[PDB]
Design a binder for this molecule. Sequence first.
Ligand SMILES: [Ca+2]
Length: 334
Amino acid sequence: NAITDGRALLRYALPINNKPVRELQASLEDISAQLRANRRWGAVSKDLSKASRILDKPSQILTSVPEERQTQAETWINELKTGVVKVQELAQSKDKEQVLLERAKLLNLVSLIEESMVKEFPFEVPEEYNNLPQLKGRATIAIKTNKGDLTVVVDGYSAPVTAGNFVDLVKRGFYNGLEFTRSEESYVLQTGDPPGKEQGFIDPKTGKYRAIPLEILAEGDKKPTYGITLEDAGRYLDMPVLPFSSFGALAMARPETEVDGASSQVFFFLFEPELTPAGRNLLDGRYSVFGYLIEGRDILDTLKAGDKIESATVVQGLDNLVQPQSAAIEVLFQ
Ligand SMILES: [Ca+2]
């Protein structure tokens, strides 16, 4: 009764306001729930007919797309219409495997359309963090390990300071050669500890550890909560927009007693519903999730002692990374 697909969490975290595209999204999302037992084909066909009816009125979606991007979005709508027909044909033969494969392609198109609706960064990051790199949008990072590639999407719309720090460190090569750790009986896979005396990244402008604030956007808020756990904000019951209950959620480690003590140590949470008890965990609202694994699920589960990151690549979204601009408009006189 909770959303556990990281791609879906990321779609819902897009700061958009368009009810039709959300209905289209929900109808296509529902297909996987209906097909988990491979029995409820009527509900699948109802989902596809609803999706088709929404696509029949593209203007109700395109009205939220800025005029610069409307024509790419029209191509995506056309691809969705073609794909829905393809899936309706597959549903007629009750081909669960192909319906699910095509459903993922359709939802990727929905994601692309939804992301094109973000017009302008949704809030002002506190100026006290203007000395830190910030990701004003999404980025996709491919992490090459000795066991294969992990692809993560990091969400600067929900965690611009945290995602910005990560993309900046990736670009600096900080993670190259760093080992993974996973305690014996643990669902937490960690990396980002320099093998040396430092605990994180040293800011070359200051000569000191580049600490980042705790940054957690609570459901329904416009601005992230900075520097305080949701519990300490009096909001223990409120959930993050980017919650922990997805396999491969990527978050910042920090000392338990230092909310603003993170820098480079990160962890993946290998969430498993089957083994997770009913009730809240000790992670949501306390540690900042800033992205999700979207490819490499089987690889992630096998990472352990001795494994390491060989390299990390910014696949998409580098242009969303904003370096500190405080001294960028200063005029010198010699
Ligand atoms: Ca160290």
